[PDB]
Amino acid sequence: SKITFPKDFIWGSATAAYQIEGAYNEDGKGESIWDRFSHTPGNIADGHTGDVACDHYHRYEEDIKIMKEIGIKSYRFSISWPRIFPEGTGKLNQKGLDFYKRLTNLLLENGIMPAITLYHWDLPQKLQDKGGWKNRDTTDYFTEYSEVIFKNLGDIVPIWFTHNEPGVVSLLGHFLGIHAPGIKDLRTSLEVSHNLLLSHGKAVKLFREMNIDAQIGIALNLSYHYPASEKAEDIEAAELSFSLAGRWYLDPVLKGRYPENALKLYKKKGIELSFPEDDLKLISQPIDFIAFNNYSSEFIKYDPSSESGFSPANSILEKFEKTDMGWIIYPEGLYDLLMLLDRDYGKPNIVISENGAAFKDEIGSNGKIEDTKRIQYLKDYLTQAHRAIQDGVNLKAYYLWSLLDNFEWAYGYNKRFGIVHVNFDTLERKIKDSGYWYKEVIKNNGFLE
Amino acid sequence: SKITFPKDFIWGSATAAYQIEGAYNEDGKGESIWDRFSHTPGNIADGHTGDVACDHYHRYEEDIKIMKEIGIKSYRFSISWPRIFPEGTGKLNQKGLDFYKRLTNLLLENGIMPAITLYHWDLPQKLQDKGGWKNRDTTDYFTEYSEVIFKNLGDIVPIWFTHNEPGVVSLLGHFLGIHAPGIKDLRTSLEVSHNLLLSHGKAVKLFREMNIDAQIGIALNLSYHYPASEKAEDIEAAELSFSLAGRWYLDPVLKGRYPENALKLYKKKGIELSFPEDDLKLISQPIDFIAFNNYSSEFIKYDPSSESGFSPANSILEKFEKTDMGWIIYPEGLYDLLMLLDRDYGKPNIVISENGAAFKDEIGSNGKIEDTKRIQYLKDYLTQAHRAIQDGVNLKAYYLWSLLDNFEWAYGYNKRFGIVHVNFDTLERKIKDSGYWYKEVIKNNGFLE
Amino acid sequence: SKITFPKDFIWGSATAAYQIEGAYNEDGKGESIWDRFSHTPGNIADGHTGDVACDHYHRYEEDIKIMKEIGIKSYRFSISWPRIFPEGTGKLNQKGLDFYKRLTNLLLENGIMPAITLYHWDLPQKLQDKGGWKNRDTTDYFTEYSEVIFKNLGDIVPIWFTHNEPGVVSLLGHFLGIHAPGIKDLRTSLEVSHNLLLSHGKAVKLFREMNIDAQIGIALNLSYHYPASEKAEDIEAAELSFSLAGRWYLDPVLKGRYPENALKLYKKKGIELSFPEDDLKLISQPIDFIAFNNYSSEFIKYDPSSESGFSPANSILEKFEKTDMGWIIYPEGLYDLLMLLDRDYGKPNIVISENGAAFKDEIGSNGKIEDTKRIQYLKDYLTQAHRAIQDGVNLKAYYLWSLLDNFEWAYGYNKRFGIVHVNFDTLERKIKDSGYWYKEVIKNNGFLE
To answer: Which residues form the active site (chains A, B, C)?
Structure first.
């Protein structure tokens, strides 16, 4: 049985700015919280940095020539705020604009469709010195930068993402402090979460004011949260996890509310926050699709000693193959999620900003990367992607994470999500077999499962 | 006739901390009443000590590898209080927690299910300088150390024991003074018995407050006490024994009372003392199972000689084969006991925390320990264990005392309960034939008697 | 059930130049490595040679009249390089050209479709004096000769084969040394394998630079390699055997890469060789079809004793009927292979350059060769050929090895794969019953199996 996606279905591959671009202090780019976080011992694996990375900034021509060789119909990327405004507000750095302008015009001229992400974590370090996302003034400055991009690139770019995974930014970056800007306070973490969503709201409101002939959305970190057992205590423990995690951002967008069962968990520890009612009507602002990033699924159990009230069910996850990240493989966990978004939020247009996997890659004696596991992963998860479309889901796009091997944040360059192998000493690209697989999948518009 | 145990039946082997661990002054471990007692002439056979013993502290990786090679489904061990709190209370020794945390995680990552005893006789010597278990305060401090263990290892460890054989600790350690701490006063011996039970009651109460997803119990020394003859004076004499011995700790924990016939014999010697009624409702606290340690059975006659009005029956006992300890072999004694725990105390869940036997082992010319008498002993007693389960008993677990040859207290190293021989000069393990037997008995889930 | 092939299905029979032509030093023909290898004691059975053979060079008229009598729709034959260039390069021998030019025109005029192989092992002996296929210059000279054949015979000949069984040439000719040119060195044997594939590339590249209105390909020696048992060691042993054997030529040509699991085996003996990257893109050069030569199948087990890591599973093979070659008869082992080529190389067009069998033939008292076993063999393998086409395989052609009895290399004339008997004293052709059977199979376009 050979499977075929809708004839209009946009195939793509995704990257971030800091994870590929390099040139961290070139052409008047301001310092970001990631430049800062990376240059401090104990933050990044092996002391790695995003100083050079894939050096896309100089080698983008080579990349596009690879992107077209595989024949992706859409290339999802991020704009570095600190290349546009070094100081986050005020003096425009025209050199930065003209990089991304030029890049987008090469894409449109190589018959590839641009898909920008406006914030992919690289907040200008100057704003971090005035409180960063905790300072509500940042949400205004994010709109200013948004404005300038829309004036230049508005009409000609069809697919916009305001934010990438605000879930992680606030959780890792502002509570656990293992991501930039390295802060560790729960209260701040929630005040940033709001201030992120608000900034999304302002950017969509501006997007409409300026009347850009293109589609906007938000890229959220999302998994399915299964209960450990079909018991009243576990099913509830899992509902709470999803609410803290993904639903905390899904409901304020889409439903104009925060999840209750999560809010009750915060106030049971002596944290309440008066959301201004008018902000939630600005966050809920209609959007042309919902985008998300999926890799794995969570299996939550009851735990009345974990101050959360729950924990991972280590008895159940030790039955799966686990990827190089230590995340389970479970392809049907994508289907169920796509059906959960379809059900609970009124059959919206869905995009997948990011799916993909990290396995240990080698270049063999044949000078090739035969990453059969990545390919196996890919087609397993894309079969469930198709299954969902057949059972009614409005899944318009799939973007593969990632196009190149890149900087994986606090893991450094010790993790490869690329379909194009990158040697971080020579910056030489060797298109993986998962890359040659994908080329055919785009051509045939599917594969024989 | 081939016997097969319930399909859910957990097979296990047991050890204690002082008896195997060694490293008696390493990584900030505080001195224990046993370290102190062992260092004094006239207390241990041949001036033996724990100090080194099996050196399990360092060689645990080797020991797990053997445990898995035999393929026990549960390892019952003891946590050293004086590794956790060198001064009983106050400054936490994180080194000692990290040992047991690591050890448990090596068991869970091999085949093996952990079973933790919280007090196997190694009271920090500091608390003994403020009276020890005579000072009621110690019962609180036990709860403090219990709390720290539950926070770390609470729900990932399924089976918990509060105490090991408080019957011996009070009798031998605080009246006969042949165990540590070497005290010889009758009043003190009863005040400790209480204080020990109370401490169990406080740990179970705290266990519930924290709401740990695991099962807690208490490991009692228990034999059957047969009358010498089927006569009114000898049946009564035997009831009074058992009541001084085992029932003194069974009735408080499961019936919330002290045995009357025993209490009457105390008061006939001019001792009462008012147990606070509220304590014995704290002791009685419901528990998930009763555990016990059995080896032999007692044959009591009536005796107006002996201040207890009873004695052993010398030459009924001189009709049995005897172990190397001088204890009779009588397998059917275990059945009757299991039936006595079942009938009285309301068909509880039963665990065997310890059963085994000590015979004079040699390494033969073939470099092997052919301990046919330990194997014979074992299978004999395990036929009467099975026979009880068939006649309705709820015996969920068997733990074989002991996994390793170890420090047998006042007898020193002169007595071997191990499957797995240990040379106490070289610290070389040689799995005994009783070991290899047990391996198969686990695998088949039984044996043809 | 009567089976019928596609209406467009091209039925053929095949011969080679050295095996049938004779006239080994006539009309200016240069000496070949097979002339040379044949004239040396110890190489060919019974001291046979191909000096005369079938003497097709003179008697081709008779042979075409036979070919048409049976009514084959295509005749696959080989061009002797040494007849075209006696010295490999330089002075053209017009006499040689005119032979093959004449031959091809007699085939077209008798309504038979030509199918030319360009190299079927007869490398001019002068090039073998400058190193032969080990000297890369040979790969350029091959292209010169390929150029002169295309100029003359390009358009009018529909089906072209660059090489026959380079697998055997390198393995048997250059490692085992039991074929010409008799060399015995492993390193050399791989350097020749590459150089051969390179020459194939150069010939296609030239075939496309001139835009000859005809379909080119390569004829590879291919079996199916079953694992002795459905076990991880034996599945893996078989994959390595197929990799060393056929896949070593399939992958370069159809995937532009050498098999990894094979390359690893070679480096583990201390042999790595840097193939220039550009050569493998030249080898991969798209081709109209893949042709292959099957007779039998292999059954490989795991073997650490063999430095290869595997060995033949004689225990299994000794359960089949065997040809006169000793090779097993296993019809289904064609089906599985046609599916393997279909699956693993993107459903290409497939030809069968050769299939057939050798059995001991006699001329009976009736002056006829009733070779029922060869007819049985044929119809058993053709039923599975059909089966594969039904189950979706793009098998366009079947060429029966061989039209005539001929010189079977090291075996001499001691083996008969003909459907036309040839007395090698008189050179008299007696069409075999297999020949008369095939004639009806072509007419009916099938048979009731």
So the answer is: 165, 354
Instruction: State the nearest Cα–Cα gap between C345 and chain A, in angstroms.
Output: 13
Compute the distance between CA of residue A38 and CA of residue A179 in angstroms, rounded to an integer: 9
Catalytic member of A165, A191, A298, A408: A165
3-state secondary structure of B437: helix
**Residue in A231, A234, A303, A318 to test binding to B, most B beta-carbons within 10 Å:** A303
What residue type is assigned to position B178 of the chain? I
Q: What is the DSSP string of C172-187?
A: IIIII-SSTT----HH
The token pair at B141 is 């401090």
Show which subunits contact C, needing at least 3 CB pairs below 8 angstroms: A
* Range list of β-strands (E), B356-418: 395-401
The H-assigned helical ranges of B71-112 are: 81-84, 94-109
CA distance A294 to A400: 10
Interatomic CA distance for residues B350 and B397, integer angstroms:
7
Q: Which helix (H) or strand (E) holds A383?
A: helix A372-390
User: A313: nearest CA in chain B?
Assistant: B156
Q: H or E stretch including A164? A: strand A159-164
Q: Which of C93, C92, C95 is nearest to C57 (CA)?
A: C95
Helices (H), ranges, C154-259:
166-168, 186-209, 232-242, 248-255
Which tokens go with A410? 């606090």
Q: Which two tokens stand for residue C26?
A: 């006539």
Cα dihedral B131, B137, B141, B147 in deg (nearest 10): 150
Distance CA B295, CA B224 (A): 10
CB-based contact B378:B357 (threshold 8 Å): yes
**How close does chain A come to C126, measured CA to CA in Å?**
34
Is B154 at the interface with chain A, CB within 8 A? yes
Contacts of A449 (CB under 8 A, 6+ apart): A1, A2, A3, A379, A383
Task: Using an 8 Å CB-CB cutoff, list chain A residues near C264.
Answer: 364-365
- Residue B393 gets the label, from left (phi > 0), alpha (psi -120 to 50) or beta, of beta
Q: A365 and C264 in contact by Cβ < 8 A?
A: yes
Tokens representing C149 are: 């054949």
C30 DSSP assignment: P
Distance CA C365, CA B58 (A): 91
Contact yes or no for A377/A421 (Cβ under 8 A): no
φ, ψ (nearest 5 deg) of residue A163: -120, 160
CA-closest candidate to residue C408, choices C299, C319, C323: C323
CB A73 within 8 A of CB A10: yes
CA distance C384 to chain A (A): 23
Contact by Cβ (8 Å): C61, C106 = yes
Q: Residue B351, SS3?
A: strand
Task: Clarify whether C165 is annotated catalytic.
Answer: yes
Contact, C197 vs C135, CB < 8 A? no
Residue C53 gets the label, from left (phi > 0), alpha (psi -120 to 50) or beta, of left
- How many angstroms separate the CA atoms of C74 and C116, rounded? 10
Interatomic CA distance for residues C167 and B349, integer angstroms: 73
Give chain A positions within 8 Å (CB) of C347: none
* PDB experimental method: X-ray
CB atoms within 10 A of CB B8: 6
Check the CA dihedral C154-C157-C158-C161 and report its sign: negative
Taken as a whole, chain C contains a residue count of 449
Chain B residue with minimum CA distance to A318: B109
Contacts of C74 (CB under 8 A, 6+ apart): C10, C11, C12, C112, C113, C114, C115, C159, C397, C399
Q: How far apart are CA B268 and CA B245, in angstroms?
A: 18
Residues in B closer than 8 angstroms to A303, CB to CB, are 155, 213
Residues 6+ away with beta carbon under 8 Å from B306: none
**Contact call for A366 and C258, based on CB within 8 A:** yes
